[PDB]
Amino acid sequence: IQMTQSPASLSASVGETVTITCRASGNIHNYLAWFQQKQGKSPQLLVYNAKTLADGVPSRFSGSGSGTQYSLKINSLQPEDFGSYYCQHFWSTPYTFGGGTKLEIKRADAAPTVSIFPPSSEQLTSGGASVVCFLNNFYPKDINVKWKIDGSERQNGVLNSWTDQDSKDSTYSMSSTLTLTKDEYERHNSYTCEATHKTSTSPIVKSFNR
Amino acid sequence: EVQLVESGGGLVQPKGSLKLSCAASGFTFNTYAMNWVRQAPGKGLEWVARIRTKTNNYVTYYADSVKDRFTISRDDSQSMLYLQMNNLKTEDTAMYYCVRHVGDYWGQGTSVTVSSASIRNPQLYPLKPCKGTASMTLGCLVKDYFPGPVTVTWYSDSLNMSTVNFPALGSELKVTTSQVTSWGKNFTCHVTHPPSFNESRTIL
């Protein structure tokens, strides 16, 4: 008895009701459980025995379904319900988990705030240099960050990471690091961070060695 | 009130052994059926093992992935749950959570990495804006750190503060940054790598 879950990614604004379904290989007889796991945190139980809510779980997390197909309806979506949701059965061993559903809190688009940070001297002595640019409080998540060194695009080596949506603002935040050798850092004197989304003009922040 | 502490997890070379301990507190131990659940670095969750009560004579169910390799066990006297992992494959690299029954209460989890490489303690660098371009923000950098996870927490003098921890981007040698927003004179980021790297650097 293995479980298949739909959809894989949902996006609704605050107040709109969503319905995640979870299918099964056979009859599990209302032995299913729903969990909410926020990024980098332990899962928390939401609904057990198909429809029975759990303690501390708000009443908007209505569970439903029966037979070999079950669902999970969240009316009045609160901004603190982002994350992935899993469905697990407990009828027969092994107790298979579900695929998951990334729930994105849709929000009004917002332009990013760009701050660029120059490499530290300790790193420069270590034989390398990394320039970090922090983009905070921006929506949507999709953003194009192009690092320019003396007016030349250098997307060859960059490590970009996106934070989870803020619990209240429902805003994303991102960090982009440009890792280069110390010889390259001394050669070029101009370094710039360019981020392109919403308005076509790119909020840019530059620096110079001096 | 119900707490679950997991310990004993870290880097273990392939074809080796590691033992995991789930120290429980806040509820009657011998009455519940204890499960273990793991989660891949970025993928979904997965059920591994379960141990029934003493009334059921400690019935154990294993998933077909670790059928002959893993060994669950419990000691209701000391109220601790154990999972002994033998012949560890590289695919078993995951974070392990001990859970009670259908998942009423979960643990903080402990990360297990099955790798042939060696622990490279992190190289933390301070990140501050250039003088003359003072701004209401700062941050730290944690480069060349293996394996996860890095415990980066912030301590600052100003009461109000805003700290955002970024995801670790890496598969062989990871790197993570963390920003702080000046809200409300100095600050420090305390990094902690699991093989005892209690180090910190201050920015002022």
Author numbering:
A (entry chain L): 2 to 211
B (entry chain H): 1 to 184, 188 to 207
Task: Quote the passages of the study that discuss this structure, keeping the authors' original sentences.
Here, we report the first crystal structures of the complex between a murine Fab/IgE (heavy and light chains naturally paired) that recognizes the allergen profilin from natural rubber latex (Hev b 8). This profilin is involved in the latex-fruit-pollen syndrome and oral-allergy syndrome and is highly cross-reactive. Profilins are involved in multiple cellular functions, such as motility, through regulation of the polymerization of actin microfilaments, binding proteins with proline-rich domains, and binding phosphatidylinositol, among others. The murine Fab/IgE 2F5 is a non-recombinant IgE obtained in response to immunization with rHev b 8 allergen.
The overall structure of the free Fab/IgE 2F5 at 3.75 Å shows three Fabs molecules per asymmetric unit. We could not model all the residues of one of the three molecules in the asymmetric unit, but the electron density was enough to model all CDRs and the backbone. We compared the structure of the three free Fabs in the asymmetric unit with the Fabs structure in the rHev b 8 Fab/IgE 2F5 complex at 3.04 Å. No changes were observed, showing no flexibility, or induced fit in the antibody paratope when the allergen epitope was recognized. The free Fab/IgE 2F5 elbow region is comparable to the complex’s structure at 3.04 Å (RMSD varies from 0.73 Å for heavy chains to 1.1 Å for light chains). The crystal structure of Fab/IgE 2F5 showed N-linked main glycosylation at the N189/F190/T191 sequon of the Fab’s heavy chain constant region.
